[PDB]
Amino acid sequence: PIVQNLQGQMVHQCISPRTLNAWVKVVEEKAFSPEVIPMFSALSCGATPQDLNTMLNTVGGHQAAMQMLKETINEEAAEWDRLHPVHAGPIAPGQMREPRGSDIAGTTSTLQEQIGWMTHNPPIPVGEIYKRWIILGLNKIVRMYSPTSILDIRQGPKEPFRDYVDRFYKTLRAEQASQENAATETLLVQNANPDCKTILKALGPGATLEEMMTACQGV
Amino acid sequence: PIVQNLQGQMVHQCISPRTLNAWVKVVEEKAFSPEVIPMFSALSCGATPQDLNTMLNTVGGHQAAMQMLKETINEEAAEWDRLHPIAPGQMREPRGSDIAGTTSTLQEQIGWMTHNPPIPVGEIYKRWIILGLNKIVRMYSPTSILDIRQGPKEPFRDYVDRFYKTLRAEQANAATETLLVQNANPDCKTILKALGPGATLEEMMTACQ
Amino acid sequence: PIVQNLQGQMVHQCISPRTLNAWVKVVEEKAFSPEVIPMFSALSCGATPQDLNTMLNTVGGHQAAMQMLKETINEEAAEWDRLHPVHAGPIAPGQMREPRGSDIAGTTSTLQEQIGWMTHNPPIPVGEIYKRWIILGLNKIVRMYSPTSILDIRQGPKEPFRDYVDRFYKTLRAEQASQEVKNAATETLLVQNANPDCKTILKALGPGATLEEMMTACQ
Amino acid sequence: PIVQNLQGQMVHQCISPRTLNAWVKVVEEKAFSPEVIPMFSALSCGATPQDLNTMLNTVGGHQAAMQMLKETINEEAAEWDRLHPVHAGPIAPGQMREPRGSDIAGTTSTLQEQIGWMTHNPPIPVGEIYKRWIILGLNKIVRMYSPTSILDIRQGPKEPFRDYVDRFYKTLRAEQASQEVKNAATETLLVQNANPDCKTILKALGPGATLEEMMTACQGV
Amino acid sequence: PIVQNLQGQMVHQCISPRTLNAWVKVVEEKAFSPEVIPMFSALSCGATPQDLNTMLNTVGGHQAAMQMLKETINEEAAEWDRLHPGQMREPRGSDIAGTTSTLQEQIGWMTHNPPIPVGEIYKRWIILGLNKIVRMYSPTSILDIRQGPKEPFRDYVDRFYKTLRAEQASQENAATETLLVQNANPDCKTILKALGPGATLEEMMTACQ
Amino acid sequence: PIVQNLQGQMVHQCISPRTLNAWVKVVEEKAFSPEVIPMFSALSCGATPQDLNTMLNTVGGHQAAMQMLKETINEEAAEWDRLHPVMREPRGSDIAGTTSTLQEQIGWMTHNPPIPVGEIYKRWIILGLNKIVRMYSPTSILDIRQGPKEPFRDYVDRFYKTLRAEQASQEVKNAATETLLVQNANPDCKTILKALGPGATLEEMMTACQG
Numbered sequence A: 001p002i003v004q005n006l007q008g009q010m011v012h013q014c015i016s017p018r019t020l021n022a023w024v025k026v027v028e029e030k031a032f033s034p035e036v037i038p039m040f041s042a043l044s045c046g047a048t049p050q051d052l053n054t055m056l057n058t059v060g061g062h063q064a065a066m067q068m069l070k071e072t073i074n075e076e077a078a079e080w081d082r083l084h085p086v087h088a089g090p091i092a093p094g095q096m097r098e099p100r101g102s103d104i105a106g107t108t109s110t111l112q113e114q115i116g117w118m119t120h121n122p123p124i125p126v127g128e129i130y131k132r133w134i135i136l137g138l139n140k141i142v143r144m145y146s147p148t149s150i151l152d153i154r155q156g157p158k159e160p161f162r163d164y165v166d167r168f169y170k171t172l173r174a175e176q177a178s179q180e181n182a183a184t185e186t187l188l189v190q191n192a193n194p195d196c197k198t199i200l201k202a203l204g205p206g207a208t209l210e211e212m213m214t215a216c217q218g219v
Numbered sequence B: 001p002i003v004q005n006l007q008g009q010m011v012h013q014c015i016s017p018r019t020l021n022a023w024v025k026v027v028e029e030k031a032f033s034p035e036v037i038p039m040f041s042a043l044s045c046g047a048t049p050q051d052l053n054t055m056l057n058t059v060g061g062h063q064a065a066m067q068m069l070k071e072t073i074n075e076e077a078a079e080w081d082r083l084h085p086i087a088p089g090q091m092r093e094p095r096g097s098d099i100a101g102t103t104s105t106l107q108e109q110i111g112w113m114t115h116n117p118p119i120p121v122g123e124i125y126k127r128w129i130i131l132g133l134n135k136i137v138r139m140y141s142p143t144s145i146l147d148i149r150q151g152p153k154e155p156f157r158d159y160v161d162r163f164y165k166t167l168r169a170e171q172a173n174a175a176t177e178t179l180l181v182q183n184a185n186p187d188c189k190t191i192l193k194a195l196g197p198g199a200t201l202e203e204m205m206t207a208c209q
Numbered sequence C: 001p002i003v004q005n006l007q008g009q010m011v012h013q014c015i016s017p018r019t020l021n022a023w024v025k026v027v028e029e030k031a032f033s034p035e036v037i038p039m040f041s042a043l044s045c046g047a048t049p050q051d052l053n054t055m056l057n058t059v060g061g062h063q064a065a066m067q068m069l070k071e072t073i074n075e076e077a078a079e080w081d082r083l084h085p086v087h088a089g090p091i092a093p094g095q096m097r098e099p100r101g102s103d104i105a106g107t108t109s110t111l112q113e114q115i116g117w118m119t120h121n122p123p124i125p126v127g128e129i130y131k132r133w134i135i136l137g138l139n140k141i142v143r144m145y146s147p148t149s150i151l152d153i154r155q156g157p158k159e160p161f162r163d164y165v166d167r168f169y170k171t172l173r174a175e176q177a178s179q180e181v182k183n184a185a186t187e188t189l190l191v192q193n194a195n196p197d198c199k200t201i202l203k204a205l206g207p208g209a210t211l212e213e214m215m216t217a218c219q
Numbered sequence D: 001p002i003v004q005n006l007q008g009q010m011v012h013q014c015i016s017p018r019t020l021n022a023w024v025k026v027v028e029e030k031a032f033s034p035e036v037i038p039m040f041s042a043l044s045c046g047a048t049p050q051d052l053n054t055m056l057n058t059v060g061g062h063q064a065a066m067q068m069l070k071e072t073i074n075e076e077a078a079e080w081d082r083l084h085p086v087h088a089g090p091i092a093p094g095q096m097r098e099p100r101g102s103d104i105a106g107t108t109s110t111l112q113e114q115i116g117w118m119t120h121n122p123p124i125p126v127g128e129i130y131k132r133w134i135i136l137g138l139n140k141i142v143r144m145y146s147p148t149s150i151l152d153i154r155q156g157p158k159e160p161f162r163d164y165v166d167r168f169y170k171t172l173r174a175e176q177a178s179q180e181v182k183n184a185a186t187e188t189l190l191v192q193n194a195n196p197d198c199k200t201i202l203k204a205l206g207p208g209a210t211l212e213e214m215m216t217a218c219q220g221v
Numbered sequence E: 001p002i003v004q005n006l007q008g009q010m011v012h013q014c015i016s017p018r019t020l021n022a023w024v025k026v027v028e029e030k031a032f033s034p035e036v037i038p039m040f041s042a043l044s045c046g047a048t049p050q051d052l053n054t055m056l057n058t059v060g061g062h063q064a065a066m067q068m069l070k071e072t073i074n075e076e077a078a079e080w081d082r083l084h085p086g087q088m089r090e091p092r093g094s095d096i097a098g099t100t101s102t103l104q105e106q107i108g109w110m111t112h113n114p115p116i117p118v119g120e121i122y123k124r125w126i127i128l129g130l131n132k133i134v135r136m137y138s139p140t141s142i143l144d145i146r147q148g149p150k151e152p153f154r155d156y157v158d159r160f161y162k163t164l165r166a167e168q169a170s171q172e173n174a175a176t177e178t179l180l181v182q183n184a185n186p187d188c189k190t191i192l193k194a195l196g197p198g199a200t201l202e203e204m205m206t207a208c209q
Numbered sequence F: 001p002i003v004q005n006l007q008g009q010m011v012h013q014c015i016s017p018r019t020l021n022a023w024v025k026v027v028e029e030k031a032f033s034p035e036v037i038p039m040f041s042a043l044s045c046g047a048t049p050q051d052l053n054t055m056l057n058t059v060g061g062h063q064a065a066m067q068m069l070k071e072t073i074n075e076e077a078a079e080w081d082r083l084h085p086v087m088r089e090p091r092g093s094d095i096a097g098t099t100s101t102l103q104e105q106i107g108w109m110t111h112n113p114p115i116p117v118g119e120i121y122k123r124w125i126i127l128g129l130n131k132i133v134r135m136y137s138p139t140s141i142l143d144i145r146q147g148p149k150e151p152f153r154d155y156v157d158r159f160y161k162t163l164r165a166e167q168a169s170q171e172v173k174n175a176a177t178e179t180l181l182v183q184n185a186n187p188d189c190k191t192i193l194k195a196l197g198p199g200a201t202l203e204e205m206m207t208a209c210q211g
Ligand SMILES: O=P(O)(O)O[C@H]1[C@H](OP(=O)(O)O)[C@@H](OP(=O)(O)O)[C@H](OP(=O)(O)O)[C@@H](OP(=O)(O)O)[C@H]1OP(=O)(O)O
Pocket: A016, A018, B016, B018, C016, C018, D016, D018, F016, F018
């Protein structure tokens, strides 16, 4: 990554073995659960395109997801090339060549060029752009790899309400690739067992989740 | 987080993998026991709203508690917007979603936190998060304090352990402790009542040994 | 904690996750064995009252011991307030206010104030004072939670002398006897409670035998 | 490795035990799967030829692959010597002798000479050149140790399409030591080797479908 | 410990949790095998008497050995007081052992010009006591190490020099070579005597391969 | 070890617990396999004689090998004293850290020009470890024969692993090793290898015998 030292310099630093092993183990253990996407975004803090490619390429399995991710990266790179055409001619002294789509993705750019863009005045954050594309692709992968539909989450006859809500919002987070309505509240209240459904319907509209789980604690 | 370097400057630093793994494992292993809230407050030392959202979002399970936490954060953000509705260099004040890192960038968060005077959006957001976590800890407590009664052959030390564990869970005030003397078995209750008021817990546990 | 940087300044540093995990695991694994108190004193090196409260509050179990520790801390704070009365007289124009009992315990003081007292010239080491109180309370807890009395430590018929002396001095360390009481109780109880073989051998060594000679003769 | 410190100096640093153990365990657990090569490239960040030789020599097994790697390194060194004949003359003042093939491989060069080449202005990245050669040899080893041909990857009757594509691009990555492998023949072989149901759906999607659309259309079949 | 930072200054540093855990686990796993003494000497690099007392006091078991070590430290302190009955004050025996000296005084002696290494002296005493403990905790006598009928010579020499290192509290003579050749099984004994006197261990183990 | 700080100075640094534990675990797990010697050379990077003695003395087992190593170190020190008759000049035992202090070792290693007592001692230690590795080698290269159904890759693995063990080195390939390699292969792979002809690289040999 590119981090700031003690002398106030933006310098390049080798990616640590702890970060590599952490990302590899996160992918091995959690597959493409939603919480993988924050973790990735946290483990690639200040990363260069080379570091991002390193994190993605060290994954051994999930090659379908990785190939999808390459297709998404190519789409976003083509859009970047359409919106930011690199002008021909020679580069002025003291200036950097403008990055193509593959330059942001670390395919046709060197590490020295990536450091140059990221530490230039004004900076071109190629690492953050590439990370944005990668996070788009990973959102697609998370939505695709979601196992269960939200319509199939129904509270058991003797299942506690807390576990039912856990499965509900876990499934919803998996299918939306996001933790961010009225249809969700109605689907939530509708799929409860008769007791909790009667209590929740008795609570009236406009109720919060804390009140809902408090009213069904032990029912 | 935003930390002070060995040269005296307040700079931004990437959140360490050990802190992330430590928080994730704390949530996975301890669920929402009370001691999770201090640990969190220690692992988010000097954290920005982005770092707080990172710590909360890396949690895989307990999505009911996390959604409750989002509701609490939205409530506190709406309250902030209600309590905080032109100079040349008048810096913009943070909205509710700006403190929560929803509508603010890392550059803006560092801007508020390092301004003169500073607006510690990280500490405010951490205050809201700790409120929500207090609610979650209070709800996830298994037993009520009124249901903590000393067994016929239960040692007094274990009974006090369960008593103050449950009490700590439900109080995420001082008159509740009176229940400790009331819910003891007849022997220990008679001895403790004989000790009178002003008796410390050490004397109580010694008298019932 | 408060540590020294490169330019010789005493600055505040966030408590590391390794120290937190080390303290939590020490409490979980060793309960309130005596060696926990030195370990604590080592893990809280240079700690502020906030850091000490963090270390105490991260303990999940032993809430009876933690409440006892809170009572002891309140006692020592009240004694501090008794020994340092707030004087009603002429204060110097640059006279900094002295910390109260609750200020040293981190209850009514902020982190900036704690750093202020600890880094002042001359310093008021509120962290070391609070750590002294906490170590007093932990001493009480260790003394109370000691399972066996020293009078009940008797060498087994086939128990090796090394294991018997190990249990003897472990129990003695747990009960915390003064050097005179530990020397008398050690001289009479140690030799007296040995099995007939080791007792005969030890008696054959003559008076004034050191523990090394006693354990060598019974090997 | 040669890294930059807090004061912006390029200094030599002893290779860390964590990097050594990480590389050794990666070789022990993953053998010569493709993902080993990126990992290597990450663990040898800023490495000198001496550090590269250290990482390669700490490998205990796979001595056939290691000896092959020595042959590849010697070939690339001979090619370097063919492309850069050092002039039989005296070294200019304030300069360094140009590195031969064995100098880049750390065989006939000292650590101080490697630091000299790597920290000179302009630098001669002997570590990056040697790493390029090593990555060539490791690419050969990965392609050779690939167990299955891409032609033998056929979707099972009840195998999910996601697992079939996983095995497909995993095998293809192993056989090419690369992930930029998706062309026309791979897309047609991919659609062709699917089970009748998924093959009918994929052909019904039409030409030019993305992999996301292909796996979405065959989800739950 | 007192270590040198990146700016060439000798400063005091808090003992790291990794060193504490390393020492505690070394004592728990290896007990008082000889190799514990070098490890200790490595983990107490640059340590003050306070740090040494910290390392010794964190040991939970082996309280007999710890009391022995305390007695040995008191003996060496009494000997130091016997040898030492703008002039800086000299440290007494209890000052070197960290009993009657503060951390400020220890740093004062250790960082003076010329330095008075109270930490290295205390470490010398502690290593003496630990040598005593290692010699006592040795399980087997060297005279009882005899090569088995089908035991390889390499394993026999391993046990031989492990036991010898345990009873010497050091691995650094001729009676050991004669006892070694004497304690071999008949085959290896005939081969070793056929090698002749003055044979090195490499030749002895090579001849029995 | 002696490492470089921010002011460009060579200063002494306490040996880390992770390096000690790494070396101890390497000895416990790998015994005296050849790859231990590079690992050692990497874990003692910039080490002082005191640090080298620390790494060697923390080994709990293999006391026969450690005593052999002590004998080799004493031989190399006596030879150093014979070749260099007498800051004070270092003796053989001074380089081995026996009769020298840490301050003296730092003095020699940080002098201009430096006297690398750590690198000399490390050379001696690596000599002794080479002896130990060659002795602890289990099998002779002449006993490595390809099984009837053993893949050629595994046979070459055992071949060059055994050869590396018997020479304490990887630079071992020559004409005798190539002819012994082709000779000890099973009839099928031997026929294919003979069909390749001379000058065939190991890559071509392993490709021709695949499957
Ligand atoms: O006190 P800590 O926060 O736990 O700092 C440690 C310490 O780093 P510094 O002393 O440089 O701050 C370790 O250094 P050692 O002395 O053990 O070598 C280092 O380990 P490395 O040697 O592997 O650099 C480790 O870093 P890592 O996280 O990469 O394990 C890092 O811990 P933090 O990174 O968590 O601060």
